[PDB]
Design a protein around this nucleic acid. Structure first.
Lengths: 18, 235, 35, 67
RNA sequence: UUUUUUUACUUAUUCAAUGAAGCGGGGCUGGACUUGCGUCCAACUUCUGGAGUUAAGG
């Protein structure tokens, strides 16, 4: 169960299709 | 031969010397509230003492026995809507010809699902085997089912995946399924499955179903606990 | 005993086929031949 | 069905299982907003006898008020 | 099994800090005591009002 490498401690809202 | 003009310049990442390299900071990410809430909800349910009626649901079927059950269940998956429509059309053709529905159709054999239906079957003792999903929320919908099956004498097993059971019954989610009756060639397989379920699951969980769950501490608190136990053993 | 609701759905399908609204049953071989 | 059992269990609000569930759910609802939408009723038998149906157009909203 | 006392744990709850950046347990290296190898304690920048960023390398 590998997870994403996050080089920042900030979570941003994912950009989605508009 | 290597170019003489290429030289290595090491970067010393000690305190106060160079800018720190970009490391994986996933352990320290400020997560959104829903992620944080679901993680702390799991943690709180681990930390508190769980009464036995809920803590019995931690013990589930193992992978081999679950796959052995699903080998029988996939033969008795219910009709899909397209297959049902085709059956209705073929039976309508026979009725248009004037033949009997008893002549053109036969007794079906399917896995029984739906919570009220399965509970009724258990009370009327028509159920041969009962599989109860692990993760029903709210848990009160299924928390009485093992005790009801023990009262009625029906063999039962708690199995991982309400989504897995819903995939059997062509739904998203099934809280419980029941095998009541199978065809003649699968009766030996059903009896072998019931005996294997008894010996593998029920004999193992008879001791542990009455025990209280929870009480598990976190990683750092646990490490403090072995450190104090080691200090006490040294003293 | 056969199902009464199934019998009612059969009668509705027979009425539709007699009216010609619903095309009758075709075997998979006939479907492959049409395709 | 199961809802008779849920009604008899919801009567017994001082048993160990019911108090454990009430405590963990109260912590969860305190962490959530003051008014927030519940995806499904947490008391399906009570909701069903009060008139909730699993039909499009029925919603459940969970709310906390100061006592 | 229950009634009082204090006395440990953290998950309820309370307080504080940050851009939630290096917490905890091991491993490597060095120093001490110890026992004849377990602890604790340290890794890294101090003459200068400069510069330090887009990785060098294996």
């Amino acid at each position: 169960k590998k997870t994403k490498v996050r080089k920042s401690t900030t979570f941003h809202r994912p950009k989605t299709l508009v | 031969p290597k170019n003489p003009l290429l030289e290595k310049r090491p970067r010393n990442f000690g305190i106060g010397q160079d800018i720190q390299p970009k490391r994986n900071l996933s352990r320290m990410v400020k997560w959104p509230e829903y992620i944080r809430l679901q993680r702390q909800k799991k943690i709180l349910r681990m930390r508190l003492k769980v009464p036995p009626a809920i803590a019995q649901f931690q013990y589930t079927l193992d992978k081999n026995l679950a796959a052995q059950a699903f080998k029988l269940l996939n033969k008795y998956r219910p009709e899909t809507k397209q297959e049902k429509k085709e059956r209705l059309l073929r039976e309508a053709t026979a009725i248009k010809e004037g033949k009997k529905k008893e002549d053109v159709s036969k007794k079906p054999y399917t896995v029984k699902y739906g919570l009220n239906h399965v509970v009724g079957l258990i009370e009327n003792k028509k159920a041969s085997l009962v599989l109860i999903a692990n993760d029903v929320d709210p848990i009160e919908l299924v928390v009485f089912l093992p005790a009801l099956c023990r009262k009625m004498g029906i063999p039962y097993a708690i199995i991982k995946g309400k989504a897995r059971l819903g995939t059997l019954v062509h739904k998203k989610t099934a809280a419980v399924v029941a095998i009541t009756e199978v065809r003649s060639e699968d009766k030996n397989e059903l009896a072998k499955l019931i005996s294997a379920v008894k010996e593998g699951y029920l004999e193992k969980v008879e001791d542990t179903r009455k025990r209280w769950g929870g009480g598990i501490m976190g990683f750092k608190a646990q490490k403090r606990e072995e450190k104090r136990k080691k200090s006490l053993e040294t003293a | 005993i056969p199902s009464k609701n199934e019998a009612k759905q059969i009668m509705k399908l027979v009425r539709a086929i007699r009216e010609g609204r619903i095309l009758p049953y075709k075997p998979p071989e006939e479907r492959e031949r049409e395709e | 069905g199961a809802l008779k059992y849920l009604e008899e269990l919801s009567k017994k609000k001082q048993s160990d299982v019911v108090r454990f569930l009430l405590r963990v759910r109260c912590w969860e609802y305190r962490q959530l907003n003051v008014i927030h939408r519940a995806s499904r009723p947490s008391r399906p038998d009570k909701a069903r006898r009060l008139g909730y149906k699993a039909k499009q157009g029925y919603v459940i909203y969970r709310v906390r008020v100061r006592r």
